[PDB]
């Protein structure tokens, strides 16, 4: 549902 | 026709609670994220993160982990804003976006202008 | 936080011209997945934004074809070919390679009549 960046690392 | 229709008061006291309703239709609601995004009036546009439409699953931007909390009425293809302890600083247009995997937010919600005022 | 900065600030084009805006971001936005994630949104007067591109260059399903984007890893343009009365309002690019996801400063375009 979401791009990479909406993913905390 | 795809829509996000949002609905909440537009005036808070300091302290209040306010709940910003964000209303899907014409598509799968599950299909695609929802993202929250506070747009101070002038100025531009601060992401405070998305909600798993699917799992329901919540993710906050550090500046909106504590009186901020994303939630679903998946039967009604809506995503819910709390924001709780309202300040001064959080009198701002509350925008929804529907968001897509490659990083399109193609369809936004109008927003809900709150204003908190004593 | 990826800084994403805009130029110019605002510009006035007549009907017709060409249109070309700046959007550079403060770390590389070429993802380890080969990708990068730039998009553009437009918002008009008083409304909610609109969706224009995505992954730099894709069209946003409906967007007109005299718009299109470039650039490679901190710098990304919009293209207008032939401005038309209603391209007028405030464009922003904005990044999803990084979290969390940021948007740049703006660019108003106004219509020169």
């Known amino acids: 549902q979401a791009p990479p960046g909406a993913y905390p690392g | 026709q795809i829509q996000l229709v949002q609905s909440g008061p537009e005036l808070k006291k300091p302290g209040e609670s306010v709940k910003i309703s964000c209303k899907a239709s014409?598509?799968?609601?599950?299909?695609?994220?929802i993202h929250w995004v506070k747009q101070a009036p002038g100025k531009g546009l601060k992401w405070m993160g998305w909600?798993?439409?699917?799992?329901?699953?919540?993710i906050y931007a550090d500046d909106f982990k504590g009186r901020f909390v994303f939630s679903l009425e998946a039967s009604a293809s809506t995503a819910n804003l709390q924001i709780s302890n309202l300040k001064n600083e959080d009198t701002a247009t509350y925008l929804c976006?529907?968001?897509?995997?490659?990083?399109?937010?193609?369809?936004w919600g109008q927003g809900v202008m709150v204003t908190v005022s004593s | 936080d990826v800084v994403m900065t805009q130029t110019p600030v605002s510009l006035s084009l007549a009907i017709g011209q060409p249109a070309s805006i700046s959007c550079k971001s403060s770390?590389?936005?070429?993802?380890?997945?080969?990708?990068?994630?730039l998009s553009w949104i437009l918002q008009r007067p008083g409304q909610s934004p609109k969706g224009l591109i995505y992954?730099?260059?894709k069209l946003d399903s409906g967007v007109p074809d005299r718009f299109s984007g470039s650039g490679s890893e901190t710098e990304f343009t919009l293209k207008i070919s032939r401005v038309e009365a209603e391209d007028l309002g405030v464009y922003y690019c904005?990044?999803?390679?990084?979290?969390?996801?940021?948007f740049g400063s703006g660019t108003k375009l106004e219509i020169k009549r």
């Open positions: 976006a529907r968001g897509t995997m490659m990083a399109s937010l193609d369809y």
């Open positions: 014409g598509y799968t609601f599950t299909d695609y994220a």
């Open positions: 909600i798993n439409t699917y799992t329901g699953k919540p």
């Open positions: 770390q590389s936005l070429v993802h380890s997945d080969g990708k990068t994630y």
């Open positions: 992954l730099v260059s």
């Open positions: 904005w990044q999803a390679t990084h979290f969390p996801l940021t």
